[PDB]
Amino acid sequence: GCGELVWVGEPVTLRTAETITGKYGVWMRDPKPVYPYTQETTWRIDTVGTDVRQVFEYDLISQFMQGYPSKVHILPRPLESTGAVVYNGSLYFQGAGSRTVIRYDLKTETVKAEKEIPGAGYHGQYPYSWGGYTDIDLAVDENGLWVIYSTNQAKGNIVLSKLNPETLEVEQTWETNIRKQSVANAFIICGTLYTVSSYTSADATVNFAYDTNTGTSKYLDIPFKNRYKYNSMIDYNPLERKLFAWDNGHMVTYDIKLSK
Ligand SMILES: [Ca+2]
Ligand code: NA
């Protein structure tokens, strides 16, 4: 059941990174899991540093909250920033120093697809407001796989493309009127793009919504809390209907409420 976002809860901390490379990262579960994985499987990637290659996998959530992975994946290309997602058994991530998105099948540990996001800025061209080479942000919603980015054609405004999750073909593209480097991050719920105003401020809000079904933006003012004052990653999981985030070394979730 879809609808408009009207409320975001307080962040709930599941794990605190004790590593020296854990200030920024991405952690996720598969909204459409495939055998032998389940909806409990969790993946973690610390992304501070160069040559980011390790992906920690946890079959059980207990293993995840205790920090003991059941398997470790070594990525075929070094990874960039915090925008990656897992979907349909594959990790989708951006190759370091490129605009290339890579589909990495987790079970076979092989690359199934590689595609340049056409015209996408990369490596600090159109990042989110905190920088960190966040130019390219993948997203999964109820409709499948998306990528959030910007281009010179769009003059730095957020662009959205719906992707074939198997071939990474661009199926459709939307150009919004929201400057990407002016927001802290973004995520998609039920075909609507939502942006967060600040990654550190105490008075942060979800401040814009762009509906791909109509091609229009609207103002929002929903309180959004950055408890640890450096939210480097905010994504939406459509199966759990929660936000997943990585705030200054803390892997957190946010409850949400949708309308209609
Ligand atoms: Ca995001
Ligand atoms: Na993402």
UniProtKB/Swiss-Prot annotation:
Changing D137G: In GLC1A; uncertain significance. Changing D137A: In GLC1A; incomplete penetrance; inhibits endoproteolytic processing; mainly accumulates as insoluble aggregates inside the endoplasmic reticulum. Changing T110I: In GLC1A; likely benign; no significant effect on protein stability. Changing A202V: In GLC1A; likely benign; no effect on protein stability. Ca(2+) binds at D137, N185, A186, I234, D235. Changing R179C: In GLC1A; uncertain significance; no effect on protein stability. The lineage of its organism: Eukaryota, Metazoa, Chordata, Craniata, Vertebrata. It comes from Homo sapiens. A motif (Microbody targeting signal) lies at residues 259-260. It is found in: Secreted. Changing E57K: In GLC1A; uncertain significance. Residues 1-260 form the Olfactomedin-like domain. The chain holds residues 244 to 503 of 504 of the full protein. Changing R99K: In GLC1A; uncertain significance. This is Myocilin, C-terminal fragment.
